[PDB]
Amino acid sequence: VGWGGSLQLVADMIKMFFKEDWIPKFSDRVIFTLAPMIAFTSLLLAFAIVPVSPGWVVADLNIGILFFLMMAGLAVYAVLFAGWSSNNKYSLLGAMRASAQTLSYEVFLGLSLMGVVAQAGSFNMTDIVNSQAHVWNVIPQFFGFITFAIAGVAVCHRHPFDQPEAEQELADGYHIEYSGMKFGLFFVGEYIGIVTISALMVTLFFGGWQGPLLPPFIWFALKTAFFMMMFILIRASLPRPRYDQVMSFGWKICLPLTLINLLVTAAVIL
């Protein structure tokens, strides 16, 4: 039997290849093609700002944080042009409610990231990875860390669980009208999304490239693997939350939490 966890996803990709493509009638054609890469390329290029090595850095640009927020905001357009390209009021309203809770729960990550970039004081990722040299920026900011966790898992990572189905009748999940390679493109996109959120979390919250007794790149890789397993553990443990309860625990509870979080970090940093 197959011994590797990734080989199942590999076979899934093989399966999506060589499948006949049908044209949709009474549909727009340019967005039907362009909507997959708005979901894929965003979290693909979210990987372009990680300091995997000082000598093998993929991009030595001055700002990486703002690019990450730009991808966070950009992701919504994939659910919107997918909703309009569904060309069925059912599916369109399903994607409208999915984009609703998406825009609703994407607010928190930037304000949660303000704490770590304020105690770091720079946008160049070399400064952040050199800041976590002895003390990581997770001990004081527990609330900011969990708020960024909720926000990162809330951006189309399936934790809300309103993507392929709809609690509300008169509408339907928006993953139905795509059946060619685009559905595999969606899955591989969320896969690079979860691994890139984990990598950004480890290299921005915890200390990357430390190397206590072993070479630091495999130290980063193993820590990323532990956070991968913990993310999968809590994603599976996380039950489906209906639309209402998600709206209830959104703007009410965590906007004050992040505002007092910014107050606490600004009071303690000086």
């Binding site: 509300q168 009748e169 008169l170 039950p239």
Partner: protein, 588 residues
Amino acid sequence: PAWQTRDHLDDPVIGELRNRFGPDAFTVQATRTGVPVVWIKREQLLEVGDFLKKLPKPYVMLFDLHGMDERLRTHREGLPAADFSVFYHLISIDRNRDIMLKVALAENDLHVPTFTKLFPNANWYERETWDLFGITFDGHPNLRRIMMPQTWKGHPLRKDYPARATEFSPFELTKAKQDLEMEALTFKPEEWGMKRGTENEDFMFLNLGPNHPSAHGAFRIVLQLDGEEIVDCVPDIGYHHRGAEKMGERQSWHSYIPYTDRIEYLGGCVNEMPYVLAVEKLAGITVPDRVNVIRVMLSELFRINSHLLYISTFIQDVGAMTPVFFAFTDRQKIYDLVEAITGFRMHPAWFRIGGVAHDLPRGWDRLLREFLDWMPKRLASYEKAALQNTILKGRSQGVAAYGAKEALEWGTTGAGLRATGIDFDVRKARPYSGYENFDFEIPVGGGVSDCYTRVMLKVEELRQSLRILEQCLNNMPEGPFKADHPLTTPPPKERTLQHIETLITHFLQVSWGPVMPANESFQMIEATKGINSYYLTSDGSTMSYRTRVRTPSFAHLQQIPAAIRGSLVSDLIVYLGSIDFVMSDVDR
């Protein structure tokens, strides 16, 4: 005996109707239904029913309305000359009595005034009579075909209609292309019921056919929407029609028993109990006490399983499904006991006329005792998890509620009707299968029937069923598992393997069938959902002449349009989940 042929002429209702109308018109039939069967010409039916409706203790609920062919009955002594008949079974709860009314019709003039004005739940019943027979009910609002498609020529319950598919042309897809063209051109002519609203921007037509889980079968409910309101909901039923009633005519009394198990997939031996009780009423068989206790044990086990499925699914759809999935493991244990007794997990087909198929295997008591001691702690964990929860409780209050009168007019029985203040169980009012030797209580909801009240009552009934099952474990008596009577089918097998006369009885009983003399029997039981009954008529042969299966889910699904009018689509879906309806039961 409880099987002897009675006329019931002495019953007070018969004498009140005799006083009111004097002599003539009424012919009191002799049957083993247990109820008074009266013939009433079709020109006085509406008058007669009205008198019964307003009588000082009225017959508030129309239990059943259907027709009989009656053309091929050779033994017709005492009945008037009829080519067709329509029977109306009515029940007075305050009298705890029943009455059956039979209107005779001739083959050239199949016309009778509609009865829906008195009882609204008769509307679908009359539609079924138009569909399966060819009686036209003049004055019916929407007299269309409710079971077969709208182009189906022929009335399938007539005896000149060949029953089996083999007599028709096989699925050559000549008609599949026409059904494809019809389905592709899905348009609304506004003939699907009243459809007062016009098809424009003001009103939106939505099939809203739930194929998702917890739908309890795939069905369509065409809905007219205005302001996200249910202007008119029209179910399109009949997709799961299996022709069980027609199947009863071409099968022997013994070989039909498997077909009973599939009227309701979750019922199992509950569905078999009324059939065997009616057949033994035709045979005149009194079973031993051990047969009664065994049947009570299997029926309470299946009732517990069905109630646990209803609770689990209810908590899953409108609540937290993490803990109640442990009931799935518990349901497996109830199943390992059923296949320990009967043999197979679902559709046991284990009940026989006069007894059961085998004796209990010798290790049944220890398994049942281990399940009965282990279960109560879990049952109390579910009781705390469901009585004390707040989120679904707040959600599940006042959601499409109805009262006693509303349930009565809509024929609704079971947990729906018990949620109101009417204390009416059939296991106490009309004891059957030895329930009168057991101690159990009937929980009641008060005066408001909603989704929380129904589940709380089902939990209380499940606790009383567990008390019945412990009384079955502690008071199971000793003796035979089959009655001693020549119509007990089959005979005890060890007797068959050694004795020539028992071998001959077994030979003719399993091959030609047992010969039941020409008479009519009727039994109703409390089922897992509502009240389920079987009205069997034998013409003296080894097969049924007429088999009528009254399923409560048909009435429960008929009731939704009266209560859901003035609600949202979400309230509709929640109500559909709450109501105890299964498509197999609605379409038999």
